Amino acid sequence: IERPEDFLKDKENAIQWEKKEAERVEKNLDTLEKEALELYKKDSEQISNYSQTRQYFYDYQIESNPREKEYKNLRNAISKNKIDKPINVYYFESPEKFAFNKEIRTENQNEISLEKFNELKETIQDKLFKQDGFKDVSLYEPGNGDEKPTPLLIHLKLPKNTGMLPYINSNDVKTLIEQDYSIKIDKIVRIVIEGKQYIKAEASIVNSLDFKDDVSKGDLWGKENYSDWSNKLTPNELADVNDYMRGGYTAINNYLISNGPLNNPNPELDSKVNNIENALKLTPIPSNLIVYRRSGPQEFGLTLTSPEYDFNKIENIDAFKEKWEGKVITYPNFISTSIGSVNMSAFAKRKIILRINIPKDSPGAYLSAIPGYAGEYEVLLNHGSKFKINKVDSYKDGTVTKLILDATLIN
Ligand SMILES: NC(=O)C1=CN([C@@H]2O[C@H](COP(=O)(O)OP(=O)(O)OC[C@H]3O[C@@H](n4cnc5c(N)ncnc54)[C@H](OP(=O)(O)O)[C@@H]3O)[C@@H](O)[C@H]2O)C=CC1
């Protein structure tokens, strides 16, 4: 191995090695992949932005989008070169990315008051932040002369077989990766560059299965882990689960939401909730997995008429963030989610997307593994589940702005 795991401050060696690696990897690229790279160096912004929200449209809108072809080829290009050993990378990020919607400091100021520091630390302490899309990173710590866009510097360790594309831009070398994981900030320290103070954050990666728009693959994973689930259930448990899916969900979830088990107990309904809950514990989720849910306004105390529901006006986004960002919401009812991220008719009008990170071994079941329910790619989560809303983002779907809530199931 002619390479360390981290070049640290050795800019000269990092560049010499990366320039060599760029020439080596270029030999494994197609005409189509090369072209995709050329489009990137021509307009990083557009491609990057597209790579972040691509999977939320209708399957057909994704397939026919002019940029989709570019995305796929550039993505293939990156996967072509999987590193044989771990490596650390560096890149500047905006504090808002981690729900810190205030400035750490200004360019004018050189120091960062302890007040800000501790506030950032408490904000991005122990939370999982999902990262998506293409990103340019550096193989050495930004020093003098280097571009320093923000006061927040991230130091990330990329696992062994992570895709990485080193390439020569104009005269210098750059590195391209595609984020497809969640980040964790293990530690932050104050450092000084060119006489100015910056925050360096030590980050770690946490992997999760996220099928995004590839529902076929998701369904395959679901069938393989839950095709025999029904056989593990007692006759009474299967009966209640079938009852639920067949239409019983209405009475049951209304009973739960109106808090009937304490305000108007119904033994026959309590029995069903119990059996379904037990059914969801027979085969806990086999690994970290991301699921999606398009929520109606009522789930967040709103109505299709509420003025706060119009996210086209930023004041309303700021209001929504102030109320929910960093908070935890509880669902008394069982919550159905999809392993797929794509939009579906009947959900076209919903403007809130709940992107949930479910920990390995959490209760839950892929209901769509039961014949007769193919088309929903449904993962049902247990009633009373709690979700911590880490970060709130937005994107435009046509003329309507929608929100994506990066959340994590906690229990
Ligand atoms: N939602 C999804 O993304 C997915 C839906 N499905 C399937 O779609 C079909 C129906 O879906 P959908 O209508 O979303 O189902 P839900 O049964 O979850 O929604 C019923 C309605 O009740 C409201 N509601 C749900 N949970 C709460 C809560 N905790 N607090 C207050 N109100 C709540 C919503 O109000 P609202 O309209 O008024 O504001 C929603 O319109 C089912 O067969 C389901 O299995 C499958 C996978 C995913």
CB-neighbour burial class of residue 192 (10 A; exposed 0-12, middle 13-18, buried 19+) = exposed
**223 phi and psi angles, rounded to 5 deg:** -60, -40
Question: Which residue pairs from 363-367 have beta carbons closer than 8 angstroms and sit at least 24 positions apart in sequence?
Answer: 363/277, 363/280, 363/281, 363/284, 363/285, 364/280, 364/284, 364/285, 365/226, 365/229, 365/279, 365/280, 365/282, 365/283, 366/222, 366/223, 366/225, 366/226, 366/229, 366/339, 367/241, 367/245, 367/336
Structure tokens at 64: 């026919």
- DSSP 8-state assignment for residue 159: P
Structure tokens at 338: 């999809």
Asked if residue 383 has its Cβ within 6 Å of ligand 1, the reply is: no
Asked if residue 248 has its Cβ within 6 Å of ligand 1, the reply is: no
Q: Is the dihedral of CA 42, 45, 46, 47 positive or negative?
A: positive
Structure tokens at 217: 């693959």
Ligand 1 atom with least separation from CA of 332: 29
H/E stretch holding 230 reads helix 229-232
DSSP reduced 3-state for 116: helix
Q: Tell me which residue of 410, 343, 276 sits closest to 53, measured CA to CA.
A: 343
* Domain ranges for the chain: 1-209, 210-411
Q: Tell me which residue of 54, 56, 91 sits closest to 70, measured CA to CA.
A: 54
CA of 286 to the centre of ligand 1 (A): 25
Q: Do domains 1-209 and 210-411 have the same CATH topology?
A: yes
The Cα 350–Cα 341 span in angstroms is 13
The residue nearest atom 32 of ligand 1, judged by CA position, is 299
Q: Tell me which residue of 249, 236, 212, 288 sits closest to 367, measured CA to CA.
A: 249
Asked if residue 116 has its Cβ within 6 Å of ligand 1, the reply is: no
The residue nearest atom 45 of ligand 1, judged by CA position, is 336
Asked if residue 297 has its Cβ within 6 Å of ligand 1, the reply is: yes
CATH fold for domain 210-411: Toxin ADP-ribosyltransferase; Chain A, domain 1 (3.90.176)
Q: Tell me which residue of 115, 50, 12, 58 sits closest to 342, measured CA to CA.
A: 58
Maximum distance among all alpha carbons in the chain? 74
Q: Are 37 and 77 in contact (CB under 8 A)?
A: yes
Residue linked to tokens 């299709």: 304
What are the Cα distances from residue 238, in Å, to 20, 244, 282, 283, 383?
A: 60, 10, 12, 14, 17
Asked if residue 331 has its Cβ within 6 Å of ligand 1, the reply is: yes
Strands 165-168 and 87-93: unpaired
What are the Cα distances from residue 18, in Å, to 135, 157, 174, 193?
A: 17, 17, 8, 23
The Cα 55–Cα 377 span in angstroms is 15
H/E stretch holding 267 reads helix 267-279
Asked if residue 284 has its Cβ within 6 Å of ligand 1, the reply is: no
Binding residues: 293-294, 296, 298-299, 333, 336, 350, 376, 378
Backbone torsion region of residue 372, taken as left when φ is above 0, otherwise alpha when ψ lies between -120 and 50, otherwise beta: left
Ligand 1 atom with least separation from CA of 293: 3
Asked if residue 293 has its Cβ within 6 Å of ligand 1, the reply is: yes
The Cα 400–Cα 300 span in angstroms is 18
- DSSP 8-state assignment for residue 227: T
1-209 CATH choice from 3.40.50.460, 3.30.70.360, 2.170.190.11, 3.90.176.10: 3.90.176.10
Q: Tell me which residue of 206, 63, 194 sits closest to 128, measured CA to CA.
A: 206
Binding residues for NADH: 293-294, 298-299, 333, 336, 350, 378
What are the Cα distances from residue 341, in Å, to 6, 155, 233?
A: 35, 29, 29
DSSP reduced 3-state for 103: coil
CA of 337 to the centre of ligand 1 (A): 9
DSSP reduced 3-state for 162: coil
Resolution to 1 decimal, in Å? 2.1
Asked if residue 306 has its Cβ within 6 Å of ligand 1, the reply is: no
CA of 146 to the centre of ligand 1 (A): 50
Binding residues for NAD(+): 293-294, 296, 298-299, 333, 350, 376, 378
CA of 298 to the centre of ligand 1 (A): 10
Q: Are 404 and 353 in contact (CB under 8 A)?
A: yes
Ligand 1 pocket test: pick from 336, 367, 385 the residue with the most ligand atoms within 8 Å of its Cβ.
Answer: 336
The Cα 270–Cα 255 span in angstroms is 9
The Cα 346–Cα 206 span in angstroms is 33
Q: Tell me which residue of 349, 307, 357, 31 sits closest to 206, measured CA to CA.
A: 357
CA of 48 to the centre of ligand 1 (A): 32
Ligand 1 atom with least separation from CA of 294: 3
Backbone torsion region of residue 24, taken as left when φ is above 0, otherwise alpha when ψ lies between -120 and 50, otherwise beta: alpha
Asked if residue 337 has its Cβ within 6 Å of ligand 1, the reply is: yes
DSSP reduced 3-state for 242: helix
CA of 209 to the centre of ligand 1 (A): 24
The residue nearest atom 30 of ligand 1, judged by CA position, is 299
